[PDB]
Structure 1
Amino acid sequence: SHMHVIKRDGRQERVMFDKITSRIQKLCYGLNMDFVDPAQITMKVIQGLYSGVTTVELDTLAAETAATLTTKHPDYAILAARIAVSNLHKETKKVFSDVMEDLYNYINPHNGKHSPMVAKSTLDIVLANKDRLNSAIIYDRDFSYNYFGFKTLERSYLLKINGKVAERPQHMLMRVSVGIHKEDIDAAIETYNLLSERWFTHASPTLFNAGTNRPQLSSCFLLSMKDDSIEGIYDTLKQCALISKSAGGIGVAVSCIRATGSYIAGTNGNSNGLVPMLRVYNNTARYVDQGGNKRPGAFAIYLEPWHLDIFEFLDLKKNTGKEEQRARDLFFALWIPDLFMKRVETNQDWSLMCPNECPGLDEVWGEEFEKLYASYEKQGRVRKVVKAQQLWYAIIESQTETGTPYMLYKDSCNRKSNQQNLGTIKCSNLCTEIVEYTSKDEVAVCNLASLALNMYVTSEHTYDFKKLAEVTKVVVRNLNKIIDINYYPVPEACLSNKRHRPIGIGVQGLADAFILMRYPFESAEAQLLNKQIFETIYYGALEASCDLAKEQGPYETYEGSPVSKGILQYDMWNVTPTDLWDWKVLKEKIAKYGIRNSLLIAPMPTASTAQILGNNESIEPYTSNIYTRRVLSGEFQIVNPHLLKDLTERGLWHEEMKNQIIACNGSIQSIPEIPDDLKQLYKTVWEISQKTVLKMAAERGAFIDQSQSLNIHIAEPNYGKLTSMHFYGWKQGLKTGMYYLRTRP
C-alpha cells in the first residue's frame, strides 16, 4: 500500500517524519546548539528513505550522515557516536548473563549442533558469580568511543549470531576479563574498570578468543625450519597452517634451505632453490585466513644475505614480471649481520654461498660469524662473489619500489637480548618487535598488551608517572595469567612458552601524549620525556615480574641470563638511566628473587587497536594533520581534533580553514594564519627530519628489551637519505633498520 516502514518490533507504520527529529534532539543533550542542527541530518536521511525499510537502516544512515557532517562542527562526532551506540544499546540485551547463556546455548541453524561461542567453564564462572559481576558493569562508558572506532569495533570484533551482532561492548570487555581472570573476581573488576576506562587494551587475538571454545590468546609466533628436507619443509608448512588457523602471526626463518643447483643425494638431481617453495607459502598465505576470515593470514620470510638465492629473493615481491616468479602476498625481510654492513661500507666483495656446502652458519653471530665466514671465504668453497654495493643497490631498488624487504640487524639483536644463554636468535615475528629464540623443538610464542598514553596526562600538563607503573603491574599480572590459560595450536609451542615464558607490552599514541603535554616533537622535553616514560614502564615491568617471582619462583632457564648476572638492558646499550627512579633496590630484589618473565617490553604497531581507541599508531608522528575517513559514498577529510581544539580557542579557525589545509596536505606551516607554536606542536612527519626520530629510537629502544617497529617516512626516492639512514641506524645501535619505506605520492 502506502510508504510503510518496518518498525524494529517487526511491524509496519506510515512514514511520520517528526519521529526522527523527535529522537535526534533527544540524543543531542549537552552539545553546542549553535551548530547542532537536526534538520540537515533529517533532510539527508529522507533523501535516502523509501518504502519498506527497516528502521535500523535509518539509524545507521543517521549516524553516517552525522559522521559526514562532522566537518562543520566537531560535536557531530559526539552526536554520531551517540546515535550508533544508542542504536546498539536499544537492540541487544541488558543483562550479561543471559547473553552468555544465549551464546553457549547456540545451535547451528541448519545442522542442529550445540556449537557454543563460549566454553562451559566460562559460563560456569559467570553463572556462579553473575550477581556481583552484573552489578560491576557500567554502560555509561560505551558513549566514549569515536564513531569510526566503534564501527571498526563492530564490524569484526563483536561476536555475531547469524549475522546480527549480539554483544554490547561492555559485554565484550567483561567477557575478556572473565576469559582471563578465571577464579578471581576482584582482579576481574579491577581489570574490567582499568580496561573499560581505556587505560590499556589487549591484543586482537585476545579480543577474538577470550573465554571462547578455542582459547588462543597469543599473537606472536616465530617458526624456523625443522629440516632441509621435504619432511621438514612440509611439516613446517603444516605448523604454519594450524597457527594461521588459530589467528596468529607467523615469522619464518628460511635461512637453512639449500640453494639453486646444489646436488640432491636422494634422487640424483639438483634443487630449484627457494622461489617455488616461497610460491607454495604464497598460496598457503592466501588460503588459510586468521580466524573467521577476520584478517588474511600473513607470513614473514626472513633470509640472511649470504644465501645464494638472494637476488631472486629480492626480486620476488614486485608488480611486473612473470607470475610464476613472484610471491607477493608475503612479507619479506633481511636478517643482516655486520659483515654485509662493513663490506657495503668499504666497497669490498661479498661471498654468496650455499648452506649445504657451508653448514651451520646462521647459528653463529658476531666475531665468530666473522671468523667462520672468513674461513669459508678462504677455502674457495663459496659459489658466487658479488660486489657488496651492487647488492645494496638491489636492496634500495626493492625498498624503493615496494618497501619490502624489512631490515633487521643480526649481531645487534643477538648481542642485546636476555636469551643469549640459549643460542642464536634466528628470526622475529611479522611486525618485527618480538626477538626470541627459535629452534627445531621450541616454537616461539609471545603475548601482547598495548597501553595507551594520553589517558595518563593530567590537567596540569605534567605527566603522571606513578600511575603508569601501577597499571603496568596490573598488565604484567594479566599477561602472566594469560600464558597459563592459553591453548597452543601446536605441541612445540607449549614447551617454549612455558619454559621461557615471555610477555610483550607496547604503547600506542605517543603523539597525543606530546600534544597533551604541549611539547614539540623534536624538542628537548620530548626526548627527555619518552626516555622518562620508558624508564617508568621498564621499571614497573621489572618490579612486577620481580613480585611475581617472589611468589612463584623464576622461570625454568633463569640462571645463566645476564639479568642473573646483574646486567639489565640499559647496560647492554651502555647508557646509565636518569635519577628518576631507584634502581639499586630493584637490582637487589632481582638479585634475591629473580624475575618471572624473560623478555618484557615490545612496541607493536597496533593498527587496529589504535583504530579503536582513536590514538595514533604507536610511536610515529601524525602522517598529516588532515586524515581521511572511509564512509560509504563519502571518503573525506577530517583534521586532527587536537589541532582543531586549539584552533577554535585561538580564534584563527574559520569556515574555510579546512580548505586552506587541503592544498598543503596537512602542512599547517604554509598558511599565513599562524601563531608559530602550532608549527612546532603539530609537525607533519614529512616535515620532520628522520634522524632526530632515529635518535629518539636509540634512546627509547635503549630502554626496551626487544625490538620496536619503525615506519620510515621519506617523501621522495633518494639514495643518500636511505643509505645514510640505514648506516646511521646501525651506528646508533638499533635492532631494526626499517619496517616500511613510505613515500607519499
Structure 2
Amino acid sequence: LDKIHRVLDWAAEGLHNVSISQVELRSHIQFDIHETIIKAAADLISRDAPDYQYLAARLAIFHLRKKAYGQFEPPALYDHVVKMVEMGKYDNHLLEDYTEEEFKQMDTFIDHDRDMTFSYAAVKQLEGKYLVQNRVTGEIYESAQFLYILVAACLFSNYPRETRLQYVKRFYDAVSTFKISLPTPIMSGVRTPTRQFSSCVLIECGDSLDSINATSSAIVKYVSQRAGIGINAGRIRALGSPIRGGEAFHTGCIPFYKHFQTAVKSCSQGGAATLFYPMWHLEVESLLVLKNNRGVEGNRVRHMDYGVQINKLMYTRLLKGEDITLFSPSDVPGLYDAFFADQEEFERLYTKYEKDDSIRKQRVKAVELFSLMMQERASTGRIYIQNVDHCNTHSPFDPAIAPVRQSNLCLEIALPTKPLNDVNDENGEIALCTLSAFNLGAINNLDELEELAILAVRALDALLDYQDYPIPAAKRGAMGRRTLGIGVINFAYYLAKHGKRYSDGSANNLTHKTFEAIQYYLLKASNELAKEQGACPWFNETTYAKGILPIDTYKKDLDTIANEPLHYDWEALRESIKTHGLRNSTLSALMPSETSSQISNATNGIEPPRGYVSIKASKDGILRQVVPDYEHLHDAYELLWEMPGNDGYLQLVGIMQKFIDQSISANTNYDPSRFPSGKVPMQQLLKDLLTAYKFGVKTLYYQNTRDGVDTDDLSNFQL
C-alpha cells in the first residue's frame, strides 16, 4: 500500500494541480498492478491539469527501469553493453571500437535523471518502437539514456581519439535534452546489428520497359524496408504512342502505374508512394482522377498519391484564360528537360511545338485543367503540387547538370535523380536523404545553432558511411552528393513563446531571422566539415560551387512581406564555400514530424496544432498530448482552425523557403463552415495556389478539409 503511495509521491514531485488522491481513486487498485496506476494517471491528462503527462511518464519510466534492470538504478554502461551484445541486441562493433575505460567515461556523461523529463506520449513511443526489446514478449532491455549515449557512440565511433569522446558527450547532451530530434530509423536502429536506416527514396523512371522494370524492382526492395517512395513516371509516353515505328503502340501510363502500385504494396498485409508527372502530359486528365472514388477499376489507381508538376507558363495560361496544350513527352524533343531546367527554352519549344501541326497534341482550357486538378486535390487531399521552375531557379543544384525533377512521399525532398536500366545499373541515380530536426522550443537563442549544426551535420554525415545500400544507384547518390535534410519541430510553440502568430503576418520577420540562422550555421558546419574531411565528390554540380547562395536566388516577392535584414556574414561564407566546398550538397528540408517530435513533446514540424490536447490511439491505450507550456501560452497559441485562411501560413512557408535547400511539406487548410453554403469556391482554391507560387513555394502537400471561376479577378495577379 504505502509502497505504492511513495512512488506516487515521488512521481508527483514538482508538479502543479495534480492529485494523488485522484490517481488512486481512478485506478481502482483497492478493488500487474503498477500498469493500472500508470493508465489512471494518463487518463487524467487535460487542459486544466497538463502536468499529469509528466506524472504518468515518470510512473512509466519507473516501471520500465524495474522491467529492464530489476531495480530503478541502471547498471554500469559497460556491463549493460556487454550483456546486450551477448544477447545479440547491440552491435558487437561497440566492444571493438571502444574500450572498457571509455565506456566508463561515457557512463560519466550519462544523466539517467533526464528520463524524468519525458512526457507520457514520449515514453509510450520509446517503449513502443525505439527502446531495444524482446521481439515477442515485449520485454524491454534498455532505458532512454542508454539509447541516446550509444547512438552518439556509434555515429562518432570512427573519430580520432583526440576528439571522439568530446563529440560523443556533445551529441548525447544535444539529443537527451531535446535540442536535436532524430528520426525513427536512427532512434530504433543505431547501436543494433541493423544497417537499414533509409526512410525516404526517390526513383526516376525512364521511358522504357527495362527502366519500368528496374523502377519496380527498386520500389519493392525499399518498401520492404518500409521506406516512403517518390516516383517520377512523367517520362512514360502517352497512350497510343508508336513503339519502334510504330511496330507496336503504347497501351498507356495507367497499366504501368498499376504495376508500380502493386510494387509499393507488395510487402503490405502499408507501403506509401507519391507519383509525379507534368501537367501538360497528354494523359493528364486521366491521371488526375486516378484516386477518384467513382469509376472503373481499369482507370483507377487509388492507393498512391500524386504530384502534379507545374511552371510559370502553365499559370500564365490560367491567368489569361487561354489554352494549355497537351503533349506526349516522346513527341516533343527537349521539352521535358527544359520544363525543369530552362524556362525560356521551355517557352520557346512549347510555343514552337504548339504551332507544329505534324505533332500529336490536344488542347484544353487552362481553367478547366486547373479546376479538375484542384477538384481532385480537394476531395482526396492527396493530389499534390510541385512548382518545378521554383525547384530549379532557387536550388543548391545546377539544373543543366543535376536538375530537380520530382520529390519524395511527403513533398519536402528535392534531389537529383537518374533512371535505371536495370536494378543494379551503376549509371542510375536514386536519391536518398538522411533526416533530423532542430527543436526550436528547446533552444535559448539562435546562436546556439552554431554548435548544434556542427553536431547534427557530422552525426548524419557519418551515418552515410555507416549505413548500407541495397541498390548501387542509391549508394552513388549518397556517396556522390552526401545530401542531408535537417528541418525543425516545435515551430508553433516557438511562435507562441515569442508572442507571434501564423495568420496575421506578425511572425514574418522572426521567421526570416530564424531560418537565416538555421541555414547559415548548417552551411558553415558543412563547410568546416569539408575543410577537415573533403567536400562531397560531386560538389562541382552544385550552385554553391559557383559561389551562388540561397540569398541570391530566392523569389523576390518575399521582399514585400518581410524587411528583416541578414544578420550573418554570408559573403565570408560565400568565399569559404567556393574555396573549401561543402561536405554535403544539401543541408535543409522541412519534413513533417508527427512521430519523432512526440519524444520532445513538440508541436509537429511547422504546423499549427489542431487543438491544445491531441488524442491518439495506441497499442495498449489512448495517448493524450498537451501542447508545450499550455498553462502559460494557451492564449498565445493559434490553433489550425482559428486561422482565417492560408495566406499568413503560406507567406511564412515562402519566407522559410528563401533559405531551405530542398523543400517544405506545406499544407493547405479549409473550413467549409467559413464559407457561404458550406462550400469552398474554386476561386479561393486557385487564389491560394497562385499565392503560394507568388512567394516561391516549391511544393504543396496535404490539403486538409475540416470535417465539422472569374479569370479576370486573377488577371491583375503578379506571378
Does TM-score exceed 0.5, indicating one fold?
yes
Alignment-mate amino acid for residue 236 of structure 2:
I
Q: Whole-Å Cα distance in 1 between the matches of residues 464 and 625 of structure 2?
A: 41
Q: Shift of the alpha carbon at 1:68?
A: 1.1
Q: Shift of the alpha carbon at 1:636?
A: 9.0
Please state if 1:44 is matched with 2:26.
yes
Aligned counterpart for 2:9 among listed residues 10, 22, 25: 25
Aligned counterpart for 2:261 among listed residues 255, 275, 282: 282
What residue number does 1:604 align with? 591
Aligned counterpart for 1:358 among listed residues 308, 328, 332: 332
1:500-554 CA-partner distances (Å, limit 9, x unpaired): 2221210111111122223344566622111111111111112112212222332
Alignment-mate amino acid for residue 590 of structure 1:
I
The change in CA–CA distance for 1:102 and 1:229 in structure 2 (over 3 A counts) is farther
Aligned counterpart for 1:399 among listed residues 366, 377, 386: 377
Q: Is the 8 A contact 1:181 1:188 kept in 2?
A: yes
Alignment-mate amino acid for residue 597 of structure 2:
A
What residue number does 2:119 align with? 146
Q: Whole-Å Cα distance in 1 between the matches of residues 113 and 565 of structure 2?
A: 41
Q: Shift of the alpha carbon at 1:603?
A: 1.0
Query: How is 1:454-465 mapped onto 2 (pairs within 5 angstroms)?
Result: 454-457=441-444, 464-465=445-446
Aligned counterpart for 2:172 among listed residues 184, 189, 192: 192
What residue number does 2:350 align with? 373
Q: Shift of the alpha carbon at 1:577?
A: 7.0
1:104-136 CA-partner distances (Å, limit 9, x unpaired): 334xxxxxxxxx444332342355532212332
Q: Is the 8 A contact 2:657 2:696 kept in 1?
A: no
Please state if 1:513 is matched with 2:518.
no
Q: Which moved more, 1:701-710 or 1:128-137?
A: 128-137
What residue number does 2:93 align with? 121
The change in CA–CA distance for 1:359 and 1:209 in structure 2 (over 3 A counts) is farther
Please state if 1:616 is matched with 2:596.
no
Q: Whole-Å Cα distance in 2 between the matches of residues 638 and 148 of structure 1?
A: 6
Please state if 1:336 is matched with 2:336.
no
1:6-57 CA-partner distances (Å, limit 9, x unpaired): xxxxxxxxxxx5554354234333334xx543343333333797xxxxx2xx
1:578-597 CA-partner distances (Å, limit 9, x unpaired): 24222232223234323222
Query: How is 1:289-304 mapped onto 2 (pairs within 5 angstroms)?
Result: 296-304=270-278
Alignment-mate amino acid for residue 23 of structure 2:
I
Please state if 1:541 is matched with 2:516.
no
Q: Whole-Å Cα distance in 1 between the matches of residues 597 and 42 of structure 2?
A: 19
Query: How is 1:446-525 mapped onto 2 (pairs within 5 angstroms)?
Result: 446-457=433-444, 464-522=445-503
Alignment-mate amino acid for residue 692 of structure 1:
G
Q: Whole-Å Cα distance in 1 between the matches of residues 377 and 436 of structure 2?
A: 30
The change in CA–CA distance for 1:188 and 1:263 in structure 2 (over 3 A counts) is same
Q: Which moved more, 1:77-86 or 1:713-722?
A: 713-722
Please state if 1:173 is matched with 2:131.
no
Q: Whole-Å Cα distance in 2 between the matches of residues 454 and 636 of structure 1?
A: 22
Q: Whole-Å Cα distance in 2 between the matches of residues 256 and 232 of structure 1?
A: 11
Q: Whole-Å Cα distance in 2 between the matches of residues 723 and 602 of structure 1?
A: 26
What residue number does 1:130 align with? 103
Q: Shift of the alpha carbon at 1:170?
A: 1.5
Alignment-mate amino acid for residue 464 of structure 2:
I
Q: Whole-Å Cα distance in 1 between the matches of residues 112 and 150 of structure 2?
A: 14
Higher relative contact order (CA 8 A, sep 6+): 2
Q: Secondary structure at the match of 1:588?
A: helix
Q: Which structure 2 residue ranges, 5 or more long, are not aligned?
A: 159-163, 420-427, 673-679, 709-719
Q: Shift of the alpha carbon at 1:244?
A: 2.1
Q: Whole-Å Cα distance in 1 between the matches of residues 625 and 432 of structure 2?
A: 39
Q: Whole-Å Cα distance in 1 between the matches of residues 601 and 626 of structure 2?
A: 13
Q: Is the 8 A contact 2:502 2:652 kept in 1?
A: no
Please state if 1:250 is matched with 2:229.
yes
Q: Is the 8 A contact 1:407 1:739 kept in 2?
A: no
The change in CA–CA distance for 1:171 and 1:535 in structure 2 (over 3 A counts) is same
Root mean square deviation, CA, Å: 2.7
Q: Is the 8 A contact 1:97 1:126 kept in 2?
A: no
What residue number does 2:532 align with? 551
1:197-235 CA-partner distances (Å, limit 9, x unpaired): 11012222222321433323333321101x433322121
What residue number does 1:673 align with? none
What residue number does 1:9 align with? none
1:255-301 CA-partner distances (Å, limit 9, x unpaired): 11122222344995433312222222222222326xxx9xx331110
What residue number does 1:414 align with? 392
Query: How is 1:669-684 mapped onto 2 (pairs within 5 angstroms)?
Result: 678=635, 681-682=637-638, 684=640
What residue number does 1:730 align with? 693
The change in CA–CA distance for 1:159 and 1:325 in structure 2 (over 3 A counts) is farther
The change in CA–CA distance for 1:496 and 1:577 in structure 2 (over 3 A counts) is farther
Q: Is the 8 A contact 1:205 1:247 kept in 2?
A: no
1:412-470 CA-partner distances (Å, limit 9, x unpaired): 1121112115243211111111211111322112111111011113xxxxxx1221222
The change in CA–CA distance for 1:288 and 1:97 in structure 2 (over 3 A counts) is farther
Q: Is the 8 A contact 1:206 1:216 kept in 2?
A: no
What residue number does 1:305 align with? 279
Q: Whole-Å Cα distance in 2 between the matches of residues 99 and 297 of structure 1?
A: 36
1:277-335 CA-partner distances (Å, limit 9, x unpaired): 2222222222326xxx9xx3311101111222222221111333344443332221111
Q: Whole-Å Cα distance in 1 between the matches of residues 430 and 620 of structure 2?
A: 46
Alignment-mate amino acid for residue 695 of structure 2:
Q
TM-score for the superposition, normalised by structure 1: 0.84
Q: Whole-Å Cα distance in 1 between the matches of residues 541 and 7 of structure 2?
A: 66
Q: Whole-Å Cα distance in 2 between the matches of residues 89 and 490 of structure 1?
A: 40
Q: Whole-Å Cα distance in 1 between the matches of residues 529 and 218 of structure 2?
A: 32
Q: How many residues align?
A: 668
Q: Whole-Å Cα distance in 1 between the matches of residues 548 and 305 of structure 2?
A: 35
Q: Is the 8 A contact 1:64 1:631 kept in 2?
A: no
Alignment-mate amino acid for residue 86 of structure 1:
F
Alignment-mate amino acid for residue 193 of structure 2:
N
Q: Secondary structure at the match of 1:484?
A: helix
Aligned counterpart for 1:695 among listed residues 627, 651, 661: 651
Q: Which moved more, 1:260-269 or 1:466-475?
A: 260-269
What residue number does 1:317 align with? 291
1:151-191 CA-partner distances (Å, limit 9, x unpaired): 12221222221332222111222231122111332211211
Q: Is the 8 A contact 1:432 1:739 kept in 2?
A: no
Q: Whole-Å Cα distance in 1 between the matches of residues 374 and 7 of structure 2?
A: 58
What residue number does 2:667 align with? 711
Please state if 1:430 is matched with 2:409.
yes
